[PDB]
Amino acid sequence: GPIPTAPRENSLMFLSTLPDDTVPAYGNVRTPPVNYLPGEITDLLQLARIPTLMAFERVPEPVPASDTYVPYVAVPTQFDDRPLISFPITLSDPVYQNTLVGAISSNFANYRGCIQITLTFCGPMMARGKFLLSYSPPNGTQPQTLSEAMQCTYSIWDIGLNSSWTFVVPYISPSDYRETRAITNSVYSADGWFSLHKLTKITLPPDCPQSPCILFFASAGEDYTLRLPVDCNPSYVF
């Protein structure tokens, strides 16, 4: 046993990321079979792709509960040359936050790949219409005009029959990943804006309810990847 060996400047020290294990306690240990239980789950990416609800504000909702940051939007009677909804491409916003992907990323450092964007409507089925969609990469101005949106990464959704539709972001990045934390709207993370315009106005027969509702979702795509999980915050305990 006693032999010349190699010490370390920090032998036996404790770092939170110690890689190996220590002495065991006992033998003779037996455990029961879990076979009767359904479907042991192994990885986050398995579940992260399930469509999650977004949390868009309720347009000055006057209830004493005040805001209702909710996945749906109502149909307006009027329209303007500016999107129904727009937002920066940033993981920190509340609509991102409480998604599966948002909750995951909240404890990760950087992100990579793309996400699935799913869309929905709630009005009477006797409705016919269309909507324009445009992803706006980073630029010198947040898109407003419909024509501007047409210049941006854009597509049009037929509300004629299907009251739901899907989209996936394209992964464009000078770096392998992008900073998950919203330290600042900077070239490291921020990636422009989104826009939403109604293509044509209302078309309904009589007796149909008016100003119906529009709903939306979000969830991870196949290519999405995160890096370096990070620690949490318990302030929600309050």
The conformational region for residue 66 under phi > 0 = left, psi -120 to 50 = alpha, else beta, is left
146 part of the interface to other proteins, by CB under 8 A: no
DSSP string, 94-157: HHHHTSHHHHHHTTEEEEES-EEEEEEE-S-TT---EEEEEEE-S-SS---SHHHHHHSEEEEE
Other beta carbons less than 10 A from residue 220's beta carbon: 27
Under the criterion CB under 5 A, does residue 5 sit at the interface with Ca ion? yes
Out of 21, 32, 66, 231, point to the residue binding a copy of itself (CB under 8 A): 32
What is the Cα–Cα distance from 137 to 172, expressed in whole angstroms? Answer: 9
2 is a site residue for Ca ion (CB under 5 A): yes
Instruction: Report the residue closest to Ca ion, judged by CB.
Output: 5
Q: Which of residues 33-72 bind other proteins (CB under 8 A)?
A: 33-34, 36-45, 47, 50-53, 55, 67-72
Q: Residue 178 or residue 197: which is nearer to a copy of itself going by CB? A: 178
CB of 5 to Ca ion, least distance (A): 2
**Angstrom distance (rounded) from CA 176 to CA 197:** 32
Window 158 to 197, contacts with a copy of itself (CB under 8 A): 176
Tokens of residue 232, six digits = 């949490």
Quick one: DSSP state of residue 235?
Answer: G
Window 7-26: residues binding a copy of itself (CB under 8 A): 7-9, 11-12, 14, 17, 19, 22-26
Binding stretches for a copy of itself (CB under 8 A): 1-9, 11-12, 14, 17, 19, 22-27, 32, 176
* Contacting positions for Ca ion (CB under 5 A): 2, 5
